[PDB]
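Summary for the steering committee. One of the milestones for this cycle was to obtain a three-dimensional model of the protein with sodium ion bound, which we needed before selecting residues for the alanine scan. The sequence and ligand used are listed below.
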Amino acid sequence: MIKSLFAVIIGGSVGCTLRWLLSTKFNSLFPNLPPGTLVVNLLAGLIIGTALAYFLRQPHLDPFWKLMITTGLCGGLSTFSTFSVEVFALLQAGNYIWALTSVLVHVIGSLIMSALGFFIITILF
Amino acid sequence: IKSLFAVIIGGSVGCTLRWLLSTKFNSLFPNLPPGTLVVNLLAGLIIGTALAYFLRQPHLDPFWKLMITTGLCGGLSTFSTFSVEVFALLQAGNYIWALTSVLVHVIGSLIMSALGFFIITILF
Amino acid sequence: SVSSVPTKLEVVAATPTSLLISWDAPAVTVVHYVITYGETGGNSPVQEFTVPGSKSTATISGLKPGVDYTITVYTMYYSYSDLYSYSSPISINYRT
Amino acid sequence: SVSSVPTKLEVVAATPTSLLISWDAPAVTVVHYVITYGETGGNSPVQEFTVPGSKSTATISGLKPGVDYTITVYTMYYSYSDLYSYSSPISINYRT
Ligand SMILES: CCCCCCCCCCO[C@@H]1O[C@H](CO)[C@@H](O[C@H]2O[C@H](CO)[C@@H](O)[C@H](O)[C@H]2O)[C@H](O)[C@H]1O
Ligand SMILES: CCCCCCCCCCO[C@@H]1O[C@H](CO)[C@@H](O[C@H]2O[C@H](CO)[C@@H](O)[C@H](O)[C@H]2O)[C@H](O)[C@H]1O
Ligand SMILES: [F-]
Ligand SMILES: [F-]
Ligand SMILES: [F-]
Ligand code: NA
């Protein structure tokens, strides 16, 4: 699996680079719940939600293109580690209300975007 | 451009580790896929130690800092895979494990960040 | 590569116009099972219905007495590689 | 590039042997502020203490009456780029 390796790297590099640009540009605007790190998780949820519904209806796509979107792009674009340190930093700052809110908005929000992705492509069919 | 290579080199290593770990292990326990958990807990551990270490060594190159955090930990961890696993359990009517997944990933990743931070802090 | 196809598909109980089927679940996150059934002699339309992934049993009603029915079950399941996808079926025949 | 340095550093209240200082917080996640203070004249040793990021005030006790003190405040703060790092200081002078 070397063709598979390139799907992960090409997809992942595009995702990580989008996260890097979005996070450095926007995170500082609202430091209680950094919007760049949120947007990349909500966007990745939206992409993989649509991918969930789409790959079901098109079962004979190449595993290359499937692996490039999910493990590559969505894997690289989203982040749990950045989400953790933001929360951890708020916890050490004594900012529990926003630490809790961050956890809810990221988790609840990402599932909502996955649902919106899934149910838009499902309904458009 | 130097910063861009840190993100790509780090990110590619992280994404590749996630890809190998997830495809190998996730199927062993499908209620709470262990490969996706391990990569998040490991990324939390790495960035926790990174938190404590970069504070005490403030004049390191932003290249090496960016390669570990945005690159490796960014590429290694995943929120999208975490979401679809939970979403799939929610559509399967498996609420108990959907909830457990959310708690174990969130609570666990903070614990590993704390362990990373407080080990390096306690070690001078 | 764990099998997402169910096993041990069988009729546990049967009247002249109904069957109760059960199956051993596959070791994957099944979202729902799709049960299909039709008359084995291949000139009558096959019907399908779904049951939730939590359930490993199903009742097929309104059948004809003394007729050979082909009954298949397949899953719609989450996997890391394929996301949501449909498994291959497990199939049995049963005369009412 | 948002400023992580505090602003509006001033003495709100003062006795002969203590000062109460307050500052406007920077628009970033401050983990703690480090307050340093020492006699402006010469080379009497400067002392520092921390206060949590939630707090935007501090009491400096045990000072000498009628002495010029230099007082600085800097933050230890989270940012996406730098992680935990120390800001540049904001400084004031105050005679007890
Ligand atoms: C729920 C699942 C997650 C579990 C794991 C989370 C681990 C989080 C670590 C918390 O770190 C502590 O946070 C305190 C604040 O919360 C800080 O107190 C500091 O600030 C307080 C006021 O905010 C003061 O009372 C303290 O004296 C002062 O040390 C303290 O330094 C810091 O080490
Ligand atoms: C999964 C959990 C792992 C458990 C490991 C064991 C950890 C036990 C708690 C450590 O004790 C804390 O250490 C901090 C130092 O790291 C101190 O913060 C002090 O120093 C900080 C900066 O280092 C400041 O932000 C604080 O305000 C100041 O109170 C803090 O008082 C003290 O209680
Ligand atoms: F993490
Ligand atoms: F966050
Ligand atoms: F996500
Ligand atoms: Na990632």
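Key point for the committee: Residues B 111, 114-115, 118, 121; D 31-32, 50, 52 surround decyl-beta-D-maltopyranoside (ligand 2) (CB under 6 Å).
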